[PDB]
Amino acid sequence: VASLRQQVEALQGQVQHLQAAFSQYKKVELFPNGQSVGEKIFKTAGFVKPFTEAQLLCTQAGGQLASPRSAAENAALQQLVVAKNEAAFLSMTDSKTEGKFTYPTGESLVYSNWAPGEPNDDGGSEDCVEIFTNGKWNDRACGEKRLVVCEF
Amino acid sequence: ASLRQQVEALQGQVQHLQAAFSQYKKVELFPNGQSVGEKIFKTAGFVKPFTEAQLLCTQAGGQLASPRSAAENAALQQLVVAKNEAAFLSMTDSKTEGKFTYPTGESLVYSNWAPGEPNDDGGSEDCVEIFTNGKWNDRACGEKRLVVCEF
Amino acid sequence: RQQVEALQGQVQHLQAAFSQYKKVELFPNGQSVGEKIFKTAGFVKPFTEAQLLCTQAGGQLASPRSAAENAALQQLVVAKNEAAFLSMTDSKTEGKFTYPTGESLVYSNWAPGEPNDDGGSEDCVEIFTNGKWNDRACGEKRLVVCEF
Ligand SMILES: [Ca+2]
Ligand SMILES: [Ca+2]
Ligand SMILES: [Ca+2]
Ligand SMILES: [Ca+2]
Ligand SMILES: [Ca+2]
Ligand SMILES: [Ca+2]
Ligand SMILES: [Ca+2]
Ligand SMILES: [Ca+2]
Ligand SMILES: [Ca+2]
């Protein structure tokens, strides 16, 4: 037995040391271009791309375009948008069924923070969503270039 | 002694984490970070006024660069030369003129003032700036200097 | 007792958090190929300054030793739309490109007619956006990509 027990005290100690260095490196990681809320991390690319290119960039990297599902997440996304001062695309579109915004998974929105008047399908052709510096959403034509923020 | 089987599998995965985390540190710190002892300095890459620079670092969990030793100052200095822009440090004397404190309130443990500094030029220099040669100069808090935080 | 299986839980939690961390770290500026990570600085510098930057950071300038590595490096160079410097030079022996360890090349992906040492001036190697290599003067400014 008790060799076993020494090994546990040893392993536990090297594990606690690794979670200490991991917390510090997580903060350094997110500065300046990232934000975490719960288990989700938003990180911006720092550049501007049309919806399809933005979505491709995020899935290829193993994530998804920012999809705020609660008020706290929208706040965290807003910090990133305020810091960069460019509005960002969110993941959701209504291109399947005009007027029903769906997460890229197909499910209906659980949270929304639409600017008054929106969504308004302006010009007959506004299928993507953009979050502005004030945290409110506006629907926008997918072909516009907006800030790429992915979530992981 | 079933446990021994699971403990050896664990040792192997801890060992895997330890080595992957070691590679990641270097990747992470490239090109905007520098570590000295237990501390990491990371530059935001952009220039901002003191009160803003300070907010950005506190919102991110950190603190503005506060070198407490020559080894710490030389590591901050390497980031400043690479970026080629002077950077604010955390210390000010906006509460008591002449007494520079860390944001916590204690007096300076190390200083590397340029000859003649701090000189409170114009009656209005309450923040400290580190130059590309590693010497500190007291500067007006409303200038825009490189944001470097410490973690 | 199962103070082991408490530890088990903490290891698996780190493995999940560390896996999420890697994705965030590599977005948008890095690529992993096997054990190797390529990461760009984002800016452009001449060979010696690029070579210093990488070694200072604990790593090396990109040395793609396989078609697979050169492809990950190329995915980075297309995203920045800027050709990158590779580690290899022939500055010791004109026409034998060496990796900085001193050995001869394993893998090459030269463009047709390269290396041609245009002007007598060309001792460093750039990778273009199409993945093809060209020998270029070391004093040109190119994207800094290091490998870890
Ligand atoms: Ca439509
Ligand atoms: Ca619509
Ligand atoms: Ca609209
Ligand atoms: Ca004063
Ligand atoms: Ca003063
Ligand atoms: Ca002064
Ligand atoms: Ca030559
Ligand atoms: Ca040559
Ligand atoms: Ca050539």
Side-chain angles (χ1 to χ4, degrees):
Chain A
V1 232
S3 34
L4 178 280
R5 211 175 174 183
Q6 300 161 2
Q7 287 189 280
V8 170
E9 271 79 303
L11 270 190
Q12 200 124 200
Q14 40 185 212
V15 173
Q16 295 182 340
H17 283 85
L18 198 54
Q19 52 187 209
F22 185 77
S23 302
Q24 178 179 40
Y25 277 84
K26 178 175 272 175
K27 287 194 277 205
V28 182
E29 179 48 50
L30 267 25
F31 181 67
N33 279 324
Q35 193 61 227
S36 47
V37 206
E39 60 154 271
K40 175 180 284 194
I41 291 178
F42 289 117
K43 183 177 179 177
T44 175
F47 51 73
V48 128
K49 285 246 129 73
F51 182 79
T52 42
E53 291 188 46
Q55 185 188 40
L56 195 262
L57 262 37
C58 301
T59 52
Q60 284 191 161
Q64 192 177 265
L65 273 173
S67 316
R69 286 177 147 235
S70 68
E73 295 187 18
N74 201 75
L77 227 182
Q78 192 198 137
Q79 268 166 117
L80 233 31
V81 170
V82 308
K84 249 60 202 171
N85 203 74
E86 198 94 34
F89 271 131
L90 308 181
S91 53
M92 30 285 217
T93 64
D94 67 346
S95 46
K96 183 173 191 160
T97 313
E98 178 60 45
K100 297 163 191 162
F101 282 83
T102 40
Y103 298 110
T105 213
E107 85 183 280
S108 301
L109 312 192
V110 168
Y111 169 75
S112 46
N113 187 40
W114 288 110
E118 310 295 335
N120 73 347
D121 203 52
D122 200 272
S125 41
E126 288 191 333
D127 294 346
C128 286
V129 182
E130 154 205 70
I131 175 165
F132 297 133
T133 53
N134 64 338
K136 298 287 178 181
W137 301 0
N138 168 42
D139 57 322
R140 202 69 195 208
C142 302
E144 289 292 330
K145 291 190 184 182
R146 288 302 182 264
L147 188 64
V148 175
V149 181
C150 303
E151 56 165 55
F152 305 86
Chain B
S2 18
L3 311 192
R4 213 79 202 259
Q5 303 164 298
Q6 295 166 318
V7 177
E8 281 205 356
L10 285 182
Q11 198 82 234
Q13 36 185 230
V14 175
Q15 194 171 344
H16 188 69
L17 281 172
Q18 238 142 60
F21 202 50
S22 301
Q23 186 176 32
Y24 272 87
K25 295 183 182 163
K26 302 182 215 293
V27 176
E28 227 274 83
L29 262 32
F30 176 65
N32 293 321
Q34 189 58 242
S35 44
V36 220
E38 225 209 35
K39 170 176 294 191
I40 300 176
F41 290 117
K42 190 173 183 180
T43 180
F46 54 71
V47 121
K48 254 168 189 176
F50 179 79
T51 45
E52 286 193 57
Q54 197 188 43
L55 249 192
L56 251 33
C57 304
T58 52
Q59 288 176 343
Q63 203 47 268
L64 267 173
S66 318
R68 297 183 159 238
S69 79
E72 289 185 22
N73 199 93
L76 222 191
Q77 186 195 170
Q78 294 179 34
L79 219 42
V80 171
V81 334
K83 267 59 199 169
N84 195 78
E85 180 69 57
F88 275 133
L89 306 178
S90 59
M91 30 274 187
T92 52
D93 64 332
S94 49
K95 64 202 289 180
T96 311
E97 184 52 55
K99 295 171 186 163
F100 279 87
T101 50
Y102 299 109
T104 180
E106 55 208 27
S107 321
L108 298 192
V109 175
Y110 166 77
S111 53
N112 198 35
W113 291 114
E117 303 299 337
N119 70 350
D120 195 53
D121 190 327
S124 58
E125 287 189 328
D126 282 6
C127 282
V128 190
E129 178 202 358
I130 177 167
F131 293 136
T132 57
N133 69 342
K135 292 296 173 181
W136 302 354
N137 170 33
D138 59 343
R139 204 66 190 223
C141 299
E143 293 301 292
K144 290 181 175 180
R145 291 296 182 260
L146 193 71
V147 186
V148 183
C149 307
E150 63 171 43
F151 297 98
Chain C
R1 280 202 185 229
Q2 310 81 328
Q3 186 201 75
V4 171
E5 288 164 57
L7 185 62
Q8 191 111 218
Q10 54 193 235
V11 177
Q12 281 160 357
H13 185 74
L14 277 177
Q15 283 179 337
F18 184 71
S19 209
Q20 184 183 43
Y21 165 88
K22 300 167 86 290
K23 292 172 175 190
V24 178
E25 180 34 49
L26 264 28
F27 181 64
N29 291 307
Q31 284 297 326
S32 47
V33 212
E35 289 173 36
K36 180 182 284 194
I37 297 169
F38 286 127
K39 189 172 179 190
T40 185
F43 47 81
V44 122
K45 261 183 169 62
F47 182 71
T48 50
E49 288 183 62
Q51 192 187 49
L52 254 190
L53 237 38
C54 297
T55 50
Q56 247 182 37
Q60 215 181 143
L61 277 168
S63 315
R65 29 186 56 185
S66 74
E69 288 183 1
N70 199 81
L73 224 199
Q74 180 202 196
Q75 208 166 138
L76 237 33
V77 162
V78 297
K80 259 63 202 161
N81 188 49
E82 199 73 70
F85 267 131
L86 301 188
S87 58
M88 14 289 201
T89 56
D90 68 334
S91 45
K92 190 177 288 178
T93 302
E94 181 54 51
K96 281 69 184 248
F97 284 80
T98 48
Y99 297 104
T101 161
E103 61 172 293
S104 319
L105 296 185
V106 175
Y107 166 82
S108 47
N109 197 43
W110 295 111
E114 305 306 329
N116 69 342
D117 196 51
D118 204 282
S121 52
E122 293 186 329
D123 293 349
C124 289
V125 181
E126 65 178 325
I127 180 181
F128 300 129
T129 37
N130 65 338
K132 297 290 173 183
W133 299 2
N134 174 30
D135 60 332
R136 199 66 183 228
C138 305
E140 292 293 298
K141 294 183 182 174
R142 295 291 181 256
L143 195 68
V144 178
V145 183
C146 301
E147 59 171 48
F148 296 91

